[PDB]
Amino acid sequence: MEHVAFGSEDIENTLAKMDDGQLDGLAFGAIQLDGDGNILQYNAAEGDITGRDPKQVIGKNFFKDVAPCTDSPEFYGKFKEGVASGNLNTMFEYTFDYQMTPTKVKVHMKKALSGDSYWVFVKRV
Secondary structure, three states: OOOOOOOOOOHHHHHOOOOHHHHOOOOOEEEEEEOOOEEEEEOHHHHHHHOOOHHHHOOOEHHHHHOHHHOOOOOHHHHHHHHHHOOOEEEEEEEEOOOOOOEEEEEEEEEOOOOOEEEEEEEEO
16 A cells, blocks of 8 residues: 555645556545546546546546536536636545445545646545
């Protein structure tokens, strides 16, 4: 297991070092998005929570294609304000319910140390 706690203040520095294999060792779901919401990385723990196959959703658009339930002011709205602003750090509870058993989660979105990319971290509550 890769040893990083959900919600850690320096999580974006820790995860900067990790390739897709290391990301699969985390204790929580992790998705890396570009500024348009396209999926760049998607780890094994996220697939365990949601049922999606990580390999298959890379390159899809999270808001339009994969996760329409997050296309709302309460999730996508927060994301797009963060991308526009160039800063994002927000944690909230949400329910994921698209083509799956409704599953309550805690979501943390944070701008990556990269460039123009953004993390979404997910764990069960």
